[PDB]
Amino acid sequence: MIIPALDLIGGTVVRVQRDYGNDPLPRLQDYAAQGAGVLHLVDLTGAKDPAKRQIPLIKTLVAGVNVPVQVGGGVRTEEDVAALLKAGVARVVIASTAVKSPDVVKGWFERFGAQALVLALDVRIDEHGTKQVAVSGWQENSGVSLEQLVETYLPVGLKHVLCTDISRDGTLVSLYEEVCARYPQIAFQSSGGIGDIDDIAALRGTGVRGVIVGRALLEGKFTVKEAIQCWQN
Numbered sequence: 125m126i127i128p129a130l131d132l133i134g135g136t137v138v139r140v141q142r143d144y145g146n147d148p149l150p151r152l153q154d155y156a157a158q159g160a161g162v163l164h165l166v167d168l169t170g171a172k173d174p175a176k177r178q179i180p181l182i183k184t185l186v187a188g189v190n191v192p193v194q195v196g197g198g199v200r201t202e203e204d205v206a207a208l209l210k211a212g213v214a215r216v217v218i219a220s221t222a223v224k225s226p227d228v229v230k231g232w233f234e235r236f237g238a239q240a241l242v243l244a245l246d247v248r249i250d251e252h253g254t255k256q257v258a259v260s261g262w263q264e265n266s267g268v269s270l271e272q273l274v275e276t277y278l279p280v281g282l283k284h285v286l287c288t289d290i291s292r293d294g295t296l297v298s299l300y301e302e303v304c305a306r307y308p309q310i311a312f313q314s315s316g317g318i319g320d321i322d323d324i325a326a327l328r329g330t331g332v333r334g335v336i337v338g339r340a341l342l343e344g345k346f347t348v349k350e351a352i353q354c355w356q357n
Contacts (some may be wrong), residue, residue: 125162125333126324127337128152129337129338130338131165132148132181133169134178138168139338141154144237148181149245153189154187154348156190157193161191162194162334163189165192165195165197166196167182174201183225186213194211195215196216197217199221202228202235205232205236205241213222215242216242217286219244220259227234230279233281242286243277243282246293247291248265248300255299256269256270256285257273283311284311285312285313286313286334287312287314288315288316292316292317292320300312300314300332301330305331312331314327314336315338316336317335321345323340323354324354328355335351337351
């Protein structure tokens, strides 16, 4: 699947920052109308301060489409996960906390179930060619490989992993081929490097299950319909 994505700050759709207006619901509705089966939202306001999580907006957006939405941004605690799910979110995207407190997050898998959680990892390919996990693009590596972290959560039934390459020069394959083959029981999602329709074609044979597409849709490079037609060949 193609997974169309929006970043939201204070109700505004933004490109990573260019203002793309305050109409997220009609945009999402049109993504769904074109065949998207899953949508992705990042709450940048909540990422900066969990106390300001955009729950009312998220409720509205989820209510306004007919497809599951995965939502990330400032998911620090069990309470955060629960509040997002209560608001109607299908899956909660766990990022830095999955790196910083694995024993705690393993407990979340036990409580909420693996179908409700997506682990989002930023990866840098280092000098030796190791897939190093980092909590963000502006922080140093955290001293754990993608494989090591995946294998930490497999015993609690990990099913969804979102992988962003934050070391790559330019737009978009070997990385995804490798990890997908190694953990066929996990559905990997790719994020980043989609600049045109050919970048989606590039991922088709890799084993990647989901392709997150954000900026390219906002910039009018191609439509969700075209993306899906390409992805399905």
